[PDB]
Design a protein around this ligand. Structure first.
Ligand SMILES: O=P(O)(O)C(Nc1cncc(-c2ccc(OC3CC3)cc2)c1)P(=O)(O)O
Ligand SMILES: O=P(O)(O)C(Nc1cncc(-c2ccc(OC3CC3)cc2)c1)P(=O)(O)O
Ligand code: NI
Ligand code: NI
Ligand code: NI
Ligand code: NI
Ligand code: NI
Ligand code: NI
Lengths: 342, 342
């Protein structure tokens, strides 16, 4: 597994990231305390996940750059850009966990729930975002791809934010409207909130670093990657209720938060009138017994089986897209990523 | 007054900003509802202030670009970049108002306090930030200053965020430590949280648009502008307690929020032991009668008089800095801005 193989060098590069994002400001001692908070923020919120998004930059870089061009410095830049993706994820999750009223993340209490943090986490999240552009400047300003990367990160953030807006719009608190939860709406939400940044961004970043900047190449890659990302968000939704939190590292809130989850969409597609009313009466509310009734209804409708069938069909479809669209990139770039997520 | 003179054309350019930040996504109808929320967000949070930061870009542009180079399109770009500064301010204020537990802003309820908004405002604030880079791309991508502007905005955001971190660190909730509130610490906080983005950013943006990209020119401008910005934040702190909210458009929260305000710093400098204990017992707490005791102590110490004397000395100092550092830029660039704020 090329990911488990690159993981150790990638993870060890973190203290170098933290050191340069502190060292860069030691010529201004007056911001010492702020920089110390930044370090706490990075340590708590950028470490402890699987690193799949950042590692995808590194793995793809190795597979797209001619081995003779992979010198020490280029590899440093690839690990930094990987870490930029992870910092973006860290920004996103800190803010998302506040907006979703989440409890735990990567097996520890959400940053905003720590005593003494609370809504100061809004600023911390944004500092994580700023660090991306500081690293890009420090490591990539002289490279021909510098502006492509800055623009890719900004664009990906805008897309992701538009997706979060749809997520939040489709899920008003205290307001049960199941008529909004359609398959068409679900697909749009997950394309924007998740697929672009989790799948397109890291590969595209590696493509740009390899000098692959053509509009058609990027469009073909994106065809595969946005579909992979849709599957990934369906799986996240499934695991929100049916996943083991000792493995997922977090407690699900989608039912309580009135979310347009893939589960509720599949539920509505299959439910009788009587089952629809049950869902209506119990969805979107904090009460544990109401949530349990929703989970029981999903179990009654065999949604776990439906998901396992979906995962098989999705995997086959993604593989067919790789056959259609991978060239001229090595298919391994996409296969290695599919292996991680399926 | 050159500001009141440019204000109308600037403010009318807003519906064009809103139209291009909607029109740009009409080739993706699936995000319609998100774009509609974005429009509400822009209307509520980018309109109703004095527009001093955005107008400074426009005024400076007119004074720094040779009149023969001020064609229709360049002026559009100057109004857009002005609006970028205002969108940055909109991002900042939406998030700040949440973190400060504020009630009103520009004479209406804070966006996050509207029923149905609440912490979804975290995402709205970030969308405002994303819009900056979308406008820069749409209007300035072909210009030689495009990367300078992207980098200036990102840098200014990072500085501002580091300043907000210090603000929040120096003001822990439920925790009265007046020993932290020193003059040295106060200056650092306000340089970073306010001076860079409110004063340096808009002028620098105009400088870059005029092709003035030299490190020394920018450093000289910054010497004036960071001091102006310190004065501006002292004044904001004074008005937080002593300003008329029908004029400021907002209710102050600095005492309740345990802030390192210029007022509390001046208070500590002058207070007897007995007055120190009063401050200690009453600062940083929600109770209206405690806040009132703090205000009474500041009045007992003639802090309003101290502020009026400060404003006179600061104005003279800023004018002396303009004499030292304005050349070769027209002094009017700095004088017009000083006139607005003093
Ligand atoms: O990991 P989680 O299951 O919490 C998922 N988290 C997730 C997935 N995709 C995008 C985001 C995201 C991105 C930006 C956000 O806010 C921007 C201002 C920060 C919030 C959330 C968050 P979700 O809540 O969608 O089920
Ligand atoms: O207008 P206000 O009096 O509320 C002032 N607002 C203000 C002044 N300077 C900087 C900010 C600011 C910037 C970024 C922020 O958070 C970034 C993630 C958004 C929060 C606040 C906010 P302050 O609270 O400092 O007295
Ligand atoms: Ni979430
Ligand atoms: Ni979410
Ligand atoms: Ni989820
Ligand atoms: Ni405030
Ligand atoms: Ni504040
Ligand atoms: Ni204030």
């Amino acid at each position: 597994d090329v990911y488990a193989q690159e993981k150790q060098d990638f993870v060890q590069h973190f203290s170098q990231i933290v050191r340069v994002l502190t060292e860069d400001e030691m010529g201004h001692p007056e911001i010492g305390d702020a920089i110390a908070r930044l370090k706490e923020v990075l340590e708590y919120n950028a470490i402890g996940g699987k690193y799949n998004r950042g590692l995808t930059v590194v793995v793809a870089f190795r597979e797209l750059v001619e081995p003779r061009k992979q010198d020490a410095d280029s590899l440093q830049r690839a690990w930094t850009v990987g870490w930029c993706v992870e910092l973006l994820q860290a920004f996103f999750l800190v803010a998302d966990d506040i907006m979703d009223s989440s409890l735990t993340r990567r097996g520890q209490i959400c940053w905003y729930q720590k005593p003494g943090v609370g809504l100061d986490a809004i600023n911390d999240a944004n500092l994580l975002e700023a660090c991306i552009y500081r690293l890009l400047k420090l490591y990539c300003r002289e490279q021909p791809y510098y502006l492509n990367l800055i623009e890719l990160f900004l664009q990906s953030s805008y897309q992701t934010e538009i997706g979060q807006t749809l997520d939040l719009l489709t899920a008003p608190q205290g307001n049960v409207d199941l008529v909004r939860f359609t398959e068409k709406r679900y697909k749009s939400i997950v394309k924007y909130k998740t697929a672009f940044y989790s799948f397109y961004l890291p590969i595209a970043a590696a493509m740009y670093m390899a000098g692959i900047d053509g509009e058609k190449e990027h469009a073909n890659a994106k065809k595969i990657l946005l579909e992979m990302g849709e599957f990934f968000q369906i799986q996240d939704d499934y695991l929100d209720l049916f996943g083991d939190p000792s493995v997922t590292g977090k407690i699900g809130t989608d039912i309580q938060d009135n979310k347009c989850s893939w589960l509720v969409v599949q539920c509505l597609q299959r439910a009788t009138p009587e089952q629809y009313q049950i869902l209506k009466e119990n969805y979107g509310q904090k009460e544990a017994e109401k949530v349990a009734r929703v989970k029981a209804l999903y179990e009654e409708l065999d949604l776990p089986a439906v998901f396992l069938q979906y995962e098989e069909d999705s995997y086959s479809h993604i593989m067919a897209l790789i056959e259609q669209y991978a060239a001229p990139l090595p298919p391994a770039v996409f296969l290695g990523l599919a292996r991680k997520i399926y």
